[PDB]
Amino acid sequence: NDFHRDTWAEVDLDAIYDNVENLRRLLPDDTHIMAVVKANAYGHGDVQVARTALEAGASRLAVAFLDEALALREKGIEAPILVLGASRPADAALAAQQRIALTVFRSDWLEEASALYSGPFPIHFHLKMDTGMGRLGVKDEEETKRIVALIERHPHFVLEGLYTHFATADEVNTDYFSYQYTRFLHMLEWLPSRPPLVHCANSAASLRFPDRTFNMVRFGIAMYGLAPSPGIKPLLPYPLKEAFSLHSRLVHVKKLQPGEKVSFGATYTAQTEEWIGTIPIGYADGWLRRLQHFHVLVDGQKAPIVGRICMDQCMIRLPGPLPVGTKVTLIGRQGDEVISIDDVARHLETINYEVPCTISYRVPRIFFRHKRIMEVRNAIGR
Amino acid sequence: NDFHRDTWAEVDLDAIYDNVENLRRLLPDDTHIMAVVKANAYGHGDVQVARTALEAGASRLAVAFLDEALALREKGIEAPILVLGASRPADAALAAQQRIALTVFRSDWLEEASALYSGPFPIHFHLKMDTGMGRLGVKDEEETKRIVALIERHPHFVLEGLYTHFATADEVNTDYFSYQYTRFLHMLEWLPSRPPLVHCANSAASLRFPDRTFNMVRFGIAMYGLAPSPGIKPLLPYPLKEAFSLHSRLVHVKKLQPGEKVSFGATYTAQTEEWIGTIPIGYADGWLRRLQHFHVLVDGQKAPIVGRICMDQCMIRLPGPLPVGTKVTLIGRQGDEVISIDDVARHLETINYEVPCTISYRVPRIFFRHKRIMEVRNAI
Ligand SMILES: Cc1ncc(COP(=O)(O)O)c(CNc2conc2O)c1O
Ligand SMILES: Cc1ncc(COP(=O)(O)O)c(CNc2conc2O)c1O
């Protein structure tokens, strides 16, 4: 629980707590919150975010694939967990003994699983319906009835839920959203019995139309304090608190003379006498090469990145001479300046979701709770 | 280990072995090969690559920072390890105890280290000289002599080597290169005595001028079978064998009707009756969103990724009806077709170095040695 390089990410768990608690109050009392923590909680720390979400009101968790669910179980999480993606029928028994719910969307998957499992633990399934996303899910009434039939036949197979996912809930215009919502209601009629859990809402849908969430919402991106899209920021019911920040420190500082070049390709040349700082973070840490024309914060001021970004380090133009060890902020606030994940996303020309997920296993995560350090997670630590 | 998702990377250790052994045969008997395995061996697997490189002829290893060095030690590697980047003066004792060599380039660093460490383990330092990279290293005579003086005075500090790094060794034009080389020889004259290890060459430099590498080369990108740059591919002394491949399997297949949308934002619309496959790999796996429109391999044919790439999945247009479980190759060979890391780098508008480093911890690595499966490493 220690690290030996001056580069780290900070995760504010009080922000995550507040983001989830505010949702708990916004939603009808009889609507459960499933916190989605796949991809190591969007790069924030799976078990740490999960524990906090459960404290704030969430009652279930969601991950992308089986390995992620098993990892949470090994770390002591006992809350129900749903695997949103595909799994192998041969792993049905493992999921059952570990009390992990599985997503199902095709009958031939059940055919195979039935021939491999015979109890005694029940397997809870969530039927995925494709209402316009085109990713995973059933689309035909025949296939839907067949899946339900195979589940009812098996004494250890249980249909615990049914859901769909929206492709454009974060768009101001709600035409396609309305289409998917209506399709969902229509497909719901294909079921002979309504399962106990009906869900469809992600962050954008739950925050914009809390009354149209049925009995469970799958809360992701907004839990981390990130807007589903900048376009709906002014439509959010409550203010979101950004939980992720990234920092480093100067490990070298030198003054260059006019003509001297910097980094690979010698693409940058100091025109006048200027101070250059080197920080221990590079593209192998998720600070991609495409960010070469971006900037960082040092001493409350913007400092542009100079030359090409390296695998483990990069250089920046300092306003003047600063001492080694001076804190640098890549994502976060310093004085009156701020660099948000959305800013980084803009220059990488991607969405905020992708940024924290790309900050590699190499960067330690320091967790804060009650304005104090709770723990440090170093993926390659002793 | 084992994994429960049909997406995995394969690392051919035989390719790594060959790439290193071929260099061993081009170098002089007294020149050491220091295998560069920082960033988890450029995303290939730190201990697996290190072990293989050592068997092939390398005698030392290099990493980016202390934690990476400590990880190798904890995994059984006992060969010498040099930390190429910065470290804290307070960690000198830890480095000494684990027999890890440290890079040094500031006198104030040594002053602090001296005050905090008094033995009993010796600490081997490698002096970094900035000859034009502008990253790390000393630049003037005064600083250099002060550093040497501080090392000589301490009973447990030892100057094991000194080095520099080239910024344009991969470029056809060798003007800036020759400039850095000449500066290095000049700066070497500031030392009262030549340390036991003098090094300066990386993959490009070692492969193009094997006779001007001094006594140790730092072999990186080429060890993995990737050319330092497209410009020097024809200048390489021997053919490099690419070691990394990435695969997945179709988990869903469906036929869409004209007018139907695919993925977030519904940016894709089927113009005719099409077969769409879903594979369990997405941007949280390092298969970045920018790879939309790129082509993957399925049933020996190229198929485009359609619609936006999601966090854990993406969709491809199939050449027709294929069964669930069909193998999809994102990087590698399938029949007569091949997709190289260079091709992925081209689409992403970056360099090959960045690609395997970005394939995340979430993707298991399967290792092959002697044409047999040797081990499975699943970070989670
Ligand atoms: C099935 C499912 N439900 C809920 C969520 C949470 O979405 P949210 O972070 O907007 O609240 C996701 C993540 N959605 C994804 C975002 O990018 N790729 C994904 O698969 C998901 O895949
Ligand atoms: C000091 C040092 N020596 C040797 C190497 C190996 O270089 P090579 O993979 O071209 O043989 C690197 C990696 N240099 C980096 C490559 O990309 N960013 C870097 O910082 C390095 O930093």
**CA atoms of B316 and A95, how far apart (whole Å):** 29
CATH superfamily membership of B13-223: Alanine racemase (3.20.20.10)
**CA atoms of A79 and B293, how far apart (whole Å):** 39
Residue among A38, A165, A177, A350 to mutate when testing ligand 1 (max atoms within 8 A of CB) = A165
**CA atoms of A351 and A199, how far apart (whole Å):** 25
> Which residues have any ligand 1 atom within 6 Å of their CB?
A 36, 84, 165, 202-204, 218-221, 228, 353; B 310-312
Q: What angle do CA A260, A265, A266 make, to 5 degrees?
A: 10
* B313 within 8 A of A68, measured Cβ to Cβ: no
Q: Tell me the sheet residues that pair with B128.
A: B163
Strand, coil or helix: B96: helix
**CA atoms of A319 and A104, how far apart (whole Å):** 57
Does ligand 2 lie within 6 Å of residue B84's CB atom?
yes
B56: left (phi over 0), alpha (psi -120 to 50) or beta: alpha
CB atoms within 10 A of CB A17: 21
- Give nearest CA residue, ligand 2 atom 14: A311
**CA atoms of B290 and B112, how far apart (whole Å):** 46
Task: Report the first-to-last Cα separation within chain A, whole angstroms.
Answer: 8
Judged by CB atoms closer than 8 Å, whether chains meet at A315 and B358 is answered as: no
Q: Tell me the sheet residues that pair with B304.
A: B295
Is A188 exposed, middle or buried, given 0-12, 13-18 or 19+ CB atoms closer than 10 A? middle
With a CB cutoff of 8 Å and minimum separation 6, the contacts of A175 are: none
* A58 within 8 A of A35, measured Cβ to Cβ: yes
Q: Which of A68, A105, A381 is facing B380, going by the closest CB pair?
A: A68
Is B13 exposed, middle or buried, given 0-12, 13-18 or 19+ CB atoms closer than 10 A? buried
Q: Which of B4, B134, B176 is facing A263, going by the closest CB pair?
A: B134
Determine the residue type at B24: R
Contacts within 8 Å (CB) and 24+ apart, B197-200 = B197/B32, B197/B126, B197/B160, B197/B161, B197/B162, B197/B163, B198/B161, B198/B162, B198/B163, B199/B34, B199/B161, B199/B163, B200/B163, B200/B164, B200/B165, B200/B166
Q: Give the distance (Å) from ligand 2 centre to CA of residue A281.
A: 14
Q: Give the distance (Å) from ligand 1 centre to CA of residue B238.
A: 47
**CA atoms of A355 and A246, how far apart (whole Å):** 11
* B284 within 8 A of B362, measured Cβ to Cβ: yes
Kindly list the domain boundaries of chain B, sorted by start residue. 1-12+243-380, 13-223
Pick the residue of B67, B165, B269, B350 with the most A CBs within 10 A to test the interface with A by mutation.
B67
Judged by CB atoms closer than 8 Å, whether chains meet at B6 and A86 is answered as: yes
Judged by CB atoms closer than 8 Å, whether chains meet at B307 and A87 is answered as: no
**CA atoms of B367 and B13, how far apart (whole Å):** 7
- Give nearest CA residue, ligand 2 atom 16: A311
* B34 within 8 A of B217, measured Cβ to Cβ: yes
**What method was applied to determine this entry?**
X-ray
CB pairs under 8 A between A and B: 222
Which atom of ligand 2 is nearest to A284's Cα?
18
Judged by CB atoms closer than 8 Å, whether chains meet at B64 and A354 is answered as: no
Q: Give the distance (Å) from ligand 2 centre to CA of residue A103.
A: 44
For A1-12+243-381, CATH gives 2.40.37.10
Q: Which of B5, B350, B362 is facing A289, going by the closest CB pair?
A: B350
**CA atoms of B61 and B329, how far apart (whole Å):** 32
* A45 within 8 A of A367, measured Cβ to Cβ: yes
Q: If you compute the radius of gyration of chain A from its CA atoms, what whole number of angstroms results?
A: 24
Judged by CB atoms closer than 8 Å, whether chains meet at A167 and B264 is answered as: yes
Ligand that comes closest to the CA of residue A216: 1
Q: Go through A211-249 and write b for each residue having 16 or more CB atoms within 10 A of its CB, e for each that does not.
A: eebbebbbbbbbbbbbbbbeebeeebeeebebbbbbbbb
**CA atoms of A80 and A53, how far apart (whole Å):** 13
The size of chain B, in residues, is 380
Q: Tell me the sheet residues that pair with B252.
A: B278
Residue among B23, B32, B36, B350 to mutate when testing ligand 2 (max atoms within 8 A of CB) = B36
**CATH class belonging to B1-12+243-380:** mainly beta
